[PDB]
A paper describes a structure:
While we also crystallized the complex structures for more lesions in this study, we were unable to obtain intact substrates in the active site of [name], presumably due to the residual glycosylase activity. Hence, we introduced an extra [name] mutation to the truncated [name](C∆95 [name]) (see the “Methods” section) and succeeded in the determination of complex structures containing 5-hydroxyuracil (5-OHU), spiroiminodihydantoin 1 (Sp1), (S)-guanidinohydentoin (Gh), dihydrothymine (DHT) and dihydrouracil (DHU), respectively. Despite the very different chemical structures of these substrates, they are recognized similarly by [name]. The damaged bases are fully extruded from the DNA helix and inserted into a relatively loose binding pocket, which allows the accommodation of substrates with varying sizes and shapes. One edge of the flipped base points towards the protein and forms close contact with the side chain of [name]. Noteworthy, across all these structures, we observed an unusually short distance (~3.0 Å) between an outwards heterocyclic nitrogen atom of the nucleobases and the terminal nitrogen atom of residue 242. Based on the similar overall conformation and detailed atomic interactions, we conclude that such a tautomerization-dependent mechanism may be a general strategy for [name] to recognize not only Tg but also 5-OHU, Sp1, Gh, DHT, and DHU. Oxidized substrates of [name] are often bulky and contain non-planar structures; this disrupted aromaticity is expected to diminish the π–π stacking with Tyr244 and hence destabilize the quarantine state. Moreover, it is expected that the bases with less solvent interactions (e.g. DHU) would favor the formation of a stable quarantine state compared with the hydrophilic bases (Sp1, 5-OHU, Gh, and Tg).
Human [name] ([name]) is a bifunctional DNA glycosylase of the Fpg/Nei family, which catalyzes the removal of damaged bases and subsequent incision of the newly generated abasic sites. Unlike traditional enzymes which are commonly referred to as highly specific biocatalysts, one special feature for [name] is its unique capability to recognize a wide range of substrates, including formamidopyrimidines, hydantoin lesions, oxidized, and dihydro-modified pyrimidine bases, derived from all four canonical bases. Here, by integrating structural, computational, and biochemical investigations, we show that [name] uses a triage mechanism to achieve broad specificity and reduce futile repair of normal bases. This mechanism involves two mutually competing interaction states: an activated state that commits catalysis and BER, and a quarantine state that temporarily separates and prevents the flipped base from catalysis via auto-inhibition.
Numbering used by the authors: 2 to 202, 222 to 246, 250 to 289
The structure:
DNA sequence: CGTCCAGTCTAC
DNA sequence: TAGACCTGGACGG
C-alpha cells in the first residue's frame, strides 16, 4: 500500500490489540526470506505507528513478564500485498509470514503480517529508513520545506509524475496518489518536476500531496474498516484506471493515468 | 487452459 | 538504472 494504507493498518493494530495481551515467540513462515524475530515474552502488548510508506510495531512486555526485556521495535514496508490481520490462531491465512499469538485467557488469536507476493520487508532496528523524506500525512510542513529547499537535486530533473514516487521527498505517495493529485490540478504528468515546483516559491501540488492521501484515510476501509471496504475507495478515484483516461509508462515502466496533455517529456 | 497486470532492493 | 522478486485476479481465446 501507500501512505494511507499504512496509516489505516497502524490504526487497525492499535485498535485491535488495545485490550489484547500476546505471549510466546514471533513465528516467521519458513517460506519468508525476511529475518527471524528474536523476541519471546510471557506477556507483551503490540502497538503501531506509521510514517509515509513505513509502519513501526513496538512489542512491549508487561510488568514482570519473563524474561526481563526491553521493548523491541520492528519496521515493516508492505510492498504490494502487505497487510495486518487479526484471526483465530487455528485459521491463519495463506501467506501469513509473521505471526504474534494472544495469551490466554480468552479467544486464542494471531496478529499476522500477510503478504501474498512477499515484496514486503521487516528490519529489527526500530529506525525509519534513512533517506526517506518526512511523512506527507503527519509531517506536512517538514515534508513541504524538504521539497522547496532541495529543488536543485537531480531528482527534480525527472518529470513530475516520476519525482512524486521519490520516497526521499514524497514519502507515502504511490501510483494511484500521483495520478489523483496531478488530475486535481490538471498538471501534465511529463511536465519537468523542478518547473512545476518553482511556480510556488489556491491548494497547490504539495498541499494536495498532504490533503489527498488524508481523504483516503478519512474514508477508512481497505481491509481495516466495515472486500466491500474497497467500495468507497473505488468510487473516490477520479483518474487511476477510470474509463476515458489516458495512460502512459514512466522511464521505470510504472503506469501513470491522466486527462489530456501528457506534457513535454513523454 | 493462457497471458498480462498489480514498490522497492540490489546487483551490474 | 533494469531486472528480479512473487502470487493471484482479470480478461481473452
Amino acid at each position: 500500500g501507500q501512505g494511507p494504507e499504512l496509516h489505516l493498518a497502524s490504526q487497525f493494530v492499535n485498535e485491535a490489540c488495545r485490550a489484547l495481551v500476546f505471549g510466546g515467540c514471533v513465528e516467521k513462515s519458513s517460506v519468508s526470506r525476511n529475518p527471524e524475530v528474536p523476541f519471546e515474552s510471557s506477556a507483551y502488548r503490540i502497538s503501531a505507528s506509521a510514517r509515509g510508506k513505513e509502519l513501526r510495531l513496538i512489542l512491549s512486555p508487561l510488568p514482570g513478564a519473563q524474561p526481563q526485556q526491553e521493548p523491541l521495535a520492528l519496521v515493516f514496508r508492505f510492498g504490494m500485498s502487505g497487510s495486518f490481520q487479526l484471526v483465530p490462531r487455528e485459521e491463519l491465512p495463506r501467506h501469513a509470514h509473521l505471526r504474534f499469538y494472544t495469551a490466554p485467557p480468552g479467544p486464542r488469536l494471531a496478529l499476522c503480517f500477510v503478504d501474498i507476493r512477499r515484496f514486503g520487508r521487516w528490519d529489527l532496528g526500530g529506525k525509519w529508513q534513512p533517506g526517506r523524506g518526512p511523512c506527507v500525512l503527519q509531517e506536512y510542513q517538514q515534508f513541504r520545506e524538504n521539497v522547496l529547499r532541495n529543488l536543485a537535486d537531480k531528482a527534480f530533473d525527472r518529470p513530475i509524475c516520476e519525482a512524486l514516487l521519490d520516497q526521499r521527498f514524497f514519502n507515502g505517495i504511490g501510483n494511484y496518489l500521483r495520478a489523483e493529485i496531478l488530475y486535481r490540478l490538471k498538471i501534465p504528468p511529463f511536465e519537468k518536476a523542478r518547473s512545476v515546483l518553482e511556480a510556488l516559491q489556491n491548494p497547490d501540488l504539495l498541499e494536495l500531496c498532504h490533503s489527498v492521501p488524508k481523504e483516503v484515510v478519512q474514508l477508512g476501509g481497505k481491509g481495516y474498516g466495515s472486500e466491500e471496504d474497497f467500495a468507497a475507495f473505488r468510487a473516490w478515484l477520479r483518474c487511476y484506471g477510470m474509463p476515458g483516461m489516458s495512460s502512459l509508462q514512466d522511464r521505470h515502466g510504472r503506469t501513470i493515468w491522466f486527462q489530456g496533455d501528457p506534457g513535454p517529456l513523454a
